[PDB]
Enzyme design. Structure first.
Site, PDB file in Angstrom:
ATOM      1  N   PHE A 177       0.571   3.533   2.328  1.00 30.98           N
ATOM      2  CA  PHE A 177       0.982   3.705   3.713  1.00 30.98           C
ATOM      3  C   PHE A 177       2.020   2.680   4.155  1.00 30.98           C
ATOM      4  O   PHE A 177       2.800   2.975   5.066  1.00 30.98           O
ATOM      5  CB  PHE A 177      -0.255   3.670   4.601  1.00 30.98           C
ATOM      6  CG  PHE A 177      -1.141   4.878   4.446  1.00 30.98           C
ATOM      7  CD1 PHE A 177      -0.775   6.077   5.027  1.00 30.98           C
ATOM      8  CD2 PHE A 177      -2.318   4.829   3.718  1.00 30.98           C
ATOM      9  CE1 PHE A 177      -1.566   7.205   4.911  1.00 30.98           C
ATOM     10  CE2 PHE A 177      -3.116   5.962   3.594  1.00 30.98           C
ATOM     11  CZ  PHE A 177      -2.735   7.149   4.193  1.00 30.98           C
ATOM     12  N   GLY A 178       2.083   1.505   3.532  1.00 32.86           N
ATOM     13  CA  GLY A 178       3.101   0.534   3.907  1.00 32.86           C
ATOM     14  C   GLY A 178       2.826  -0.843   3.326  1.00 32.86           C
ATOM     15  O   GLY A 178       2.117  -0.981   2.329  1.00 32.86           O
ATOM     16  N   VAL A 190       2.689  -5.417   4.398  1.00 28.84           N
ATOM     17  CA  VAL A 190       2.443  -6.420   5.432  1.00 28.84           C
ATOM     18  C   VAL A 190       3.175  -7.713   5.100  1.00 28.84           C
ATOM     19  O   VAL A 190       3.074  -8.221   3.979  1.00 28.84           O
ATOM     20  CB  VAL A 190       0.948  -6.721   5.633  1.00 28.84           C
ATOM     21  CG1 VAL A 190       0.790  -7.995   6.432  1.00 28.84           C
ATOM     22  CG2 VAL A 190       0.295  -5.559   6.322  1.00 28.84           C
ATOM     23  N   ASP A 228     -15.277   0.405   9.796  1.00 25.78           N
ATOM     24  CA  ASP A 228     -15.008  -0.294   8.543  1.00 25.78           C
ATOM     25  C   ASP A 228     -15.156  -1.801   8.717  1.00 25.78           C
ATOM     26  O   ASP A 228     -14.362  -2.594   8.194  1.00 25.78           O
ATOM     27  CB  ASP A 228     -13.622   0.053   7.998  1.00 25.78           C
ATOM     28  CG  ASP A 228     -13.562  -0.072   6.515  1.00 25.78           C
ATOM     29  OD1 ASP A 228     -14.634  -0.382   5.889  1.00 25.78           O
ATOM     30  OD2 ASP A 228     -12.445   0.094   5.988  1.00 25.78           O
ATOM     31  N   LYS A 235       3.518  -5.136   9.961  1.00 28.19           N
ATOM     32  CA  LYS A 235       3.141  -4.018   9.102  1.00 28.19           C
ATOM     33  C   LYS A 235       4.203  -2.922   9.175  1.00 28.19           C
ATOM     34  O   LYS A 235       4.710  -2.608  10.255  1.00 28.19           O
ATOM     35  CB  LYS A 235       1.770  -3.447   9.492  1.00 28.19           C
ATOM     36  CG  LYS A 235       1.220  -2.412   8.509  1.00 28.19           C
ATOM     37  CD  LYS A 235      -0.122  -1.828   8.954  1.00 28.19           C
ATOM     38  CE  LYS A 235      -0.656  -0.771   7.958  1.00 28.19           C
ATOM     39  NZ  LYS A 235      -2.075  -0.311   8.259  1.00 28.19           N
ATOM     40  N   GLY A 286       0.800  -1.215   0.000  1.00 25.73           N
ATOM     41  CA  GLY A 286       0.000   0.000   0.000  1.00 25.73           C
ATOM     42  C   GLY A 286       0.834   1.268   0.000  1.00 25.73           C
ATOM     43  O   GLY A 286       2.062   1.234   0.103  1.00 25.73           O
TER      44      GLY A 286
HETATM   45  C1  LIG Z   1      -2.267 -15.293   4.435  1.00 22.19           C
HETATM   46  O1  LIG Z   1      -2.213 -13.900   4.370  1.00 22.19           O
HETATM   47  C2  LIG Z   1      -2.166 -13.203   5.565  1.00 22.19           C
HETATM   48  C3  LIG Z   1      -2.846 -11.822   5.435  1.00 22.19           C
HETATM   49  N1  LIG Z   1      -2.779 -10.990   6.634  1.00 22.19           N
HETATM   50  C4  LIG Z   1      -2.870  -9.651   6.732  1.00 22.19           C
HETATM   51  C5  LIG Z   1      -2.710  -9.336   8.054  1.00 22.19           C
HETATM   52  C6  LIG Z   1      -2.705  -8.073   8.864  1.00 22.19           C
HETATM   53  C7  LIG Z   1      -2.626  -7.161   9.605  1.00 22.19           C
HETATM   54  C8  LIG Z   1      -2.247  -6.024  10.570  1.00 22.19           C
HETATM   55  C9  LIG Z   1      -3.185  -5.173  11.118  1.00 22.19           C
HETATM   56  C10 LIG Z   1      -2.751  -4.171  11.970  1.00 22.19           C
HETATM   57  N2  LIG Z   1      -3.519  -3.175  12.651  1.00 22.19           N
HETATM   58  C11 LIG Z   1      -4.813  -3.319  13.173  1.00 22.19           C
HETATM   59  C12 LIG Z   1      -5.522  -2.192  13.911  1.00 22.19           C
HETATM   60  O2  LIG Z   1      -5.394  -4.300  12.983  1.00 22.19           O
HETATM   61  C13 LIG Z   1      -1.447  -3.998  12.299  1.00 22.19           C
HETATM   62  C14 LIG Z   1      -0.521  -4.821  11.784  1.00 22.19           C
HETATM   63  C15 LIG Z   1      -0.908  -5.806  10.947  1.00 22.19           C
HETATM   64  C16 LIG Z   1       0.300  -6.604  10.500  1.00 22.19           C
HETATM   65  C17 LIG Z   1      -2.493 -10.523   8.715  1.00 22.19           C
HETATM   66  C18 LIG Z   1      -2.315 -10.848  10.057  1.00 22.19           C
HETATM   67  N3  LIG Z   1      -2.288  -9.834  11.032  1.00 22.19           N
HETATM   68  N4  LIG Z   1      -2.154 -12.065  10.379  1.00 22.19           N
HETATM   69  C19 LIG Z   1      -2.191 -13.019   9.501  1.00 22.19           C
HETATM   70  N5  LIG Z   1      -2.383 -12.769   8.256  1.00 22.19           N
HETATM   71  C20 LIG Z   1      -2.549 -11.525   7.831  1.00 22.19           C
END
Ligand SMILES: COCCn1cc(C#Cc2cc(NC(C)=O)ccc2C)c2c(N)ncnc21
Ligand SMILES: COCCn1cc(C#Cc2cc(NC(C)=O)ccc2C)c2c(N)ncnc21
Lengths: 255, 262
Positions: free
Chosen positions: A20-21, A23, A128, A37, A18
């Site tokens: 913004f960053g 993952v 959201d 992230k 994205g």
């Molecule tokens: C097989 O594809 C995996 C896709 N996928 C995407 C993810 C995400 C996220 C995330 C959300 C926030 N912030 C808040 C407020 O939620 C911060 C940081 C991250 C990394 C994520 C996850 N977390 N775990 C497993 N799979 C994940």
């Protein structure tokens, strides 16, 4: 206290991208599988990434994605738990979607409602809620994470976002669950959606969905935000669903 | 009841010409604009020319060219609905094509997939799915056409198992759809550019697959590659392809941004 050292993180697989960053799937201290992230310097104030993570430090629930750690100085990293199966939206539309039946899908709705019930207790607002922001783990675990078709009219038009507008989105999320992640209001563009729901249009009962469950959707879609039920009520309704509401449930071709 | 007399037909414009016969635009009775397919006697058996019409009588769908009538006595004719904008191939490479962008081209793909989903539900196989056999109408309507080879259950468009062993199935039609997606995203360029048929076959048997066309999202190239999975049973269905393409710009590529060509 949440701070961790940079050499403790290992970014292995890039999951998303994205402005913004990004993952990634990775490891924390060589032992813990994690989601990571990142922030792209310049594209956004660190303050904005820091706000999100400050909020994640205050919220804790088994159906909300858990923050494990942060790197606050730029370049920033936000570490959370790892939901192996990715986004509910992808899950529903993909190879696993085709075996989900009504009992699995209503259990997924109960978990999401339990997490949203917690947000409701804490007097927070999501803004959201939809399948693309629900994360799925092993054993069908679903956790809340992080668009006029999902947005209650009073929010979209007047900016009045509340837990009751989140309840409206939950109702829309129930249709995603029962159509295997099909876009809601099919063949209608946003502007058509807006005009129609203002005039009272509501999505019909999805094929093979019991009318009792579409009744719940419609409660979530009551024009008057204060007529919409609570997440506490929705959680209980879906938890008890196959005894109190559809005790004569019989499996079919898709639900 | 599909039979009609010749005098109700009025052939006006020669649209195309071929070794099996021709295609003409005309009038049916005195009000209905129609397309009329012709056979040159002797160039092909009448039973074989009629086979297409036999199949078209059983199939009916808004995304499949509709049969109106037939003339079974020699010289045979097949009368169908008229598609004002001609073949998708000509459209794509011609002057109207150059402004087509990804949202239009995926909607075209969604329409073609809806018709092939119908073919799939009816347990038919097309066997000749490609841009040259999709017809374009008003409002960018696309309909599957030319079911000469179609029946109840061109190696650049043909799945290896069909080309080699004659195993034609709805899954080989799915392989062709993947190829058609590349025609859609290159403005109708021949696939496998610079490869002759034999090297194409050799390469795809060795696992080669066309890469992501310039400016095409990887998500859409992933779909092509799913369609090209060696194991025909691992290829997705047209039902899935239709749903995926219909929902593409919300569920899959919500951050899509226009570019110079797609
Ligand atoms: C097989 O594809 C995996 C896709 N996928 C995407 C993810 C995400 C996220 C995330 C959300 C926030 N912030 C808040 C407020 O939620 C911060 C940081 C991250 C990394 C994520 C996850 N977390 N775990 C497993 N799979 C994940
Ligand atoms: C500006 O160029 C127009 C070119 N062009 C060629 C056409 C054709 C055809 C056709 C296809 C089938 N097969 C099935 C399975 O449908 C049978 C008979 C015919 C004649 C055709 C058409 N039909 N309409 C408008 N333009 C057409």
């Amino acid at each position: 206290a949440w701070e961790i050292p940079r050499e403790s993180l290992r970014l292995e697989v890039k999951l998303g991208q994205g402005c913004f960053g990004e993952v990634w799937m990775g490891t924390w201290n060589g032992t813990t599988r994690v989601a990571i992230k990142t922030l792209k310097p310049g594209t956004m104030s660190p303050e904005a990434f820091l706000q999100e993570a400050q909020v994640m430090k205050k919220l804790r629930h088994e159906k909300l994605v858990q923050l494990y750690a942060v790197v606050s100085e730029e370049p920033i990293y936000i570490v959370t738990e790892y939901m192996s199966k990715g986004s509910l939206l992808d899950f529903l539309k993909g190879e696993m979607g085709k075996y989900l039946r009504l009992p699995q899908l209503v259990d997924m709705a109960a978990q999401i409602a339990s997490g949203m019930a917690y947000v409701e207790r804490m007097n927070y607002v999501h803004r959201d809620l939809r399948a693309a922001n629900i994360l799925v783990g092993e054993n069908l675990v679903c956790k809340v994470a992080d668009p006029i078709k999902w947005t209650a009219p009073e929010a979209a038009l007047y900016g009045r976002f509340t837990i009751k507008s989140d309840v409206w989105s939950f109702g829309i999320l129930l249709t995603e669950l029962t159509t295997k992640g099909r876009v809601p209001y099919p063949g209608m563009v946003n502007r058509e959606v807006l005009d129609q729901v203002e005039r009272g249009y509501r999505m019909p009962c999805p094929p093979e969905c019991p009318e009792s469950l579409h009744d719940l959707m419609c409660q979530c879609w009551r024009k008057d935000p204060e007529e919409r039920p609570t997440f506490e009520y929705l959680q209980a309704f879906l938890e008890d669903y196959f005894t109190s509401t559809e005790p004569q449930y019989q499996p079919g071709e898709n639900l």
